[PDB]
Amino acid sequence: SKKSVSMILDIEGTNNEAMNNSALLALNNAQKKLNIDTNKVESDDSSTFSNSIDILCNDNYDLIIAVGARFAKPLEMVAKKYPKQQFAIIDYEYDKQPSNITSISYEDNKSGYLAGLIAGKMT
């Protein structure tokens, strides 16, 4: 039975481009080892971030991955409303880590760790 992963990225400016590309490569690499569907959402408008994550929580994804520290607040808010939904955030660590949110460093994003994490979560 196929699993599905959605990735939401902050594309305002150019300062996130490298990290964004690494996140996308990691997802593509995971897909090659697993039986997974993928989807991506891109936005430069941080005001719509919480709405967009909420929509993904109603689209049957086994994992929702947010790329960038600008997702910190809207992701924490939405994750409270969907306790069984698994989420990941790249380049941010919460002081008090929510039980359904896994944090991944900028380093782990490009080391193969992210693809591995996705594989372990999907299996």
Tab-separated table of C-alpha atoms in Angstrom:
chain	number	residue	atom	x	y	z
A	1	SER	CA	0.000	0.000	0.000
A	2	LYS	CA	1.630	3.272	-1.192
A	3	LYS	CA	2.451	5.998	1.278
A	4	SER	CA	2.574	9.667	0.412
A	5	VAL	CA	4.807	12.638	1.445
A	6	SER	CA	4.170	16.329	0.832
A	7	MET	CA	6.824	19.035	1.070
A	8	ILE	CA	6.033	22.742	1.580
A	9	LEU	CA	8.828	25.273	0.783
A	10	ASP	CA	9.416	28.978	1.485
A	11	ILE	CA	10.515	30.529	-1.839
A	12	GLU	CA	10.698	34.259	-0.910
A	13	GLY	CA	14.059	35.624	-2.022
A	14	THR	CA	17.055	33.497	-2.920
A	15	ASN	CA	18.589	32.822	0.501
A	16	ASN	CA	16.727	29.482	0.765
A	17	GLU	CA	17.528	28.147	-2.742
A	18	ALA	CA	20.378	25.808	-1.782
A	19	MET	CA	18.527	24.278	1.178
A	20	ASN	CA	15.382	23.975	-0.928
A	21	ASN	CA	17.215	22.068	-3.626
A	22	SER	CA	18.780	19.732	-1.102
A	23	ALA	CA	15.399	19.047	0.500
A	24	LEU	CA	13.889	18.230	-2.889
A	25	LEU	CA	16.766	15.942	-3.829
A	26	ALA	CA	16.420	14.089	-0.532
A	27	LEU	CA	12.699	13.529	-1.242
A	28	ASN	CA	13.376	12.351	-4.760
A	29	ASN	CA	16.072	9.960	-3.442
A	30	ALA	CA	13.726	8.526	-0.832
A	31	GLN	CA	11.135	7.918	-3.572
A	32	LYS	CA	13.624	5.810	-5.479
A	33	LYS	CA	14.070	3.461	-2.531
A	34	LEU	CA	10.466	3.356	-1.404
A	35	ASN	CA	6.962	3.070	-2.767
A	36	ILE	CA	5.897	6.622	-2.178
A	37	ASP	CA	3.914	9.335	-3.900
A	38	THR	CA	5.233	12.903	-3.591
A	39	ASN	CA	3.822	16.377	-3.772
A	40	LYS	CA	5.256	19.864	-3.269
A	41	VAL	CA	3.803	23.237	-2.372
A	42	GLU	CA	5.803	26.486	-2.833
A	43	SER	CA	4.932	29.913	-1.375
A	44	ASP	CA	6.584	33.338	-0.924
A	45	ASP	CA	3.592	34.556	1.188
A	46	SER	CA	4.096	33.567	4.887
A	47	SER	CA	0.598	34.760	5.760
A	48	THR	CA	-0.908	31.723	3.966
A	49	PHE	CA	1.485	29.125	5.498
A	50	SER	CA	-0.888	27.907	8.248
A	51	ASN	CA	-3.798	27.590	5.793
A	52	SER	CA	-1.669	25.622	3.338
A	53	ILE	CA	-0.448	23.188	6.027
A	54	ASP	CA	-4.010	22.730	7.223
A	55	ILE	CA	-5.075	21.772	3.698
A	56	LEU	CA	-2.231	19.179	3.552
A	57	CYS	CA	-3.502	17.711	6.846
A	58	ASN	CA	-6.775	16.978	4.977
A	59	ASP	CA	-5.114	15.452	1.870
A	60	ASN	CA	-4.026	12.069	3.309
A	61	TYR	CA	-0.216	12.466	3.551
A	62	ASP	CA	1.758	10.131	5.868
A	63	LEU	CA	4.327	12.908	6.295
A	64	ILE	CA	4.293	16.644	5.756
A	65	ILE	CA	7.734	18.281	5.497
A	66	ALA	CA	8.134	22.056	5.990
A	67	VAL	CA	11.425	23.552	4.728
A	68	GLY	CA	12.678	26.628	6.626
A	69	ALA	CA	12.502	28.402	9.989
A	70	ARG	CA	9.675	30.643	8.732
A	71	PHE	CA	7.321	27.607	9.077
A	72	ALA	CA	8.061	27.238	12.826
A	73	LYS	CA	5.027	29.114	14.146
A	74	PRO	CA	2.343	28.141	11.563
A	75	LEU	CA	3.414	24.478	11.780
A	76	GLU	CA	3.241	24.325	15.570
A	77	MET	CA	-0.270	25.850	15.445
A	78	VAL	CA	-1.577	23.346	12.891
A	79	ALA	CA	0.149	20.315	14.383
A	80	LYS	CA	-1.870	20.829	17.591
A	81	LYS	CA	-5.087	20.417	15.521
A	82	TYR	CA	-4.008	17.094	13.940
A	83	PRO	CA	-2.334	15.009	16.655
A	84	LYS	CA	-1.896	11.801	14.580
A	85	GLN	CA	-0.419	13.739	11.603
A	86	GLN	CA	3.353	13.339	11.311
A	87	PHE	CA	5.329	16.400	10.447
A	88	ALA	CA	9.007	17.333	9.887
A	89	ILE	CA	10.647	20.726	9.831
A	90	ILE	CA	14.015	21.495	8.221
A	91	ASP	CA	16.402	24.069	9.835
A	92	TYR	CA	14.545	24.631	13.120
A	93	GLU	CA	14.500	23.128	16.605
A	94	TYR	CA	11.689	23.885	19.078
A	95	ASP	CA	12.557	24.513	22.749
A	96	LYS	CA	9.622	22.351	23.716
A	97	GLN	CA	9.428	19.839	20.801
A	98	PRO	CA	5.880	18.857	19.759
A	99	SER	CA	5.343	15.085	19.838
A	100	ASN	CA	4.294	14.934	16.120
A	101	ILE	CA	7.090	17.163	14.778
A	102	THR	CA	10.611	15.921	13.951
A	103	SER	CA	13.262	18.552	13.531
A	104	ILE	CA	16.072	18.129	10.980
A	105	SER	CA	19.156	20.334	10.837
A	106	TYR	CA	20.510	22.113	7.704
A	107	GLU	CA	23.390	19.546	7.871
A	108	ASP	CA	21.170	16.479	8.086
A	109	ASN	CA	19.065	17.927	5.217
A	110	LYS	CA	21.957	17.282	2.765
A	111	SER	CA	23.852	14.324	4.338
A	112	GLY	CA	21.449	11.552	3.258
A	113	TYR	CA	19.912	11.697	6.737
A	114	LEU	CA	16.703	13.197	5.490
A	115	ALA	CA	16.112	10.441	2.896
A	116	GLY	CA	16.858	7.906	5.562
A	117	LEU	CA	14.466	9.514	8.000
A	118	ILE	CA	11.688	9.470	5.422
A	119	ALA	CA	12.382	5.768	4.735
A	120	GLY	CA	12.319	4.886	8.408
A	121	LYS	CA	9.081	6.811	8.977
A	122	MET	CA	7.353	5.229	5.953
A	123	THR	CA	8.361	1.735	7.086
